[PDB]
Design a protein around this ligand. Structure first.
Ligand code: 2GP
Ligand code: CA
Ligand code: CA
Length: 104
């Protein structure tokens, strides 16, 4: 069973932890990868009800299980905060334009 489902993509907690660890490490070293400069601040324009505190940062989580290193980011993202806490897992899949909806 999936811990998180983003559209058709199935993710386990290990998947999200691995993705978060890579993005958080880049955040600490003050480095970014890709044309869209990940990881970067996530403003929560959508108004999701995150239980943990801000600031939030978004980082791509890939369906292949591979850690994002620069190319096409895909539709899925893990959102983490300054204390290395997972705020949520979101996706552009099933959402209009560049909006996001939460993975279930
Ligand atoms: N939809 C959305 N985009 C955000 C948010 N915070 C930052 N962004 C960025 O604001 C712009 C419009 O969506 C994009 O550059 C997007 O970055 P990403 O495209 O990298 O997600 C947010 O909370 N919601
Ligand atoms: Ca997996
Ligand atoms: Ca692989």
């Amino acid at each position: 069973a999936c811990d998180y489902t983003c559209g058709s993509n199935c993710y386990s907690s290990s998947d999200t932890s691995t993705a978060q660890a890579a993005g958080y490490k880049l955040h600490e070293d003050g480095e970014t990868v890709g044309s869209n400069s990940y990881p970067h601040k996530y403003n929560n324009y959508e108004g999701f009800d995150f239980s943990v505190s801000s600031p939030y940062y978004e980082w791509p989580i890939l369906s292949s299980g591979d850690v994002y290193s620069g190319g096409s980011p895909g539709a899925d993202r893990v959102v983490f905060n300054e204390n290395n806490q997972l705020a949520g897992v979101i996706t552009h899949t099933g959402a209009s334009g560049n909006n996001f909806v939460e993975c279930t």
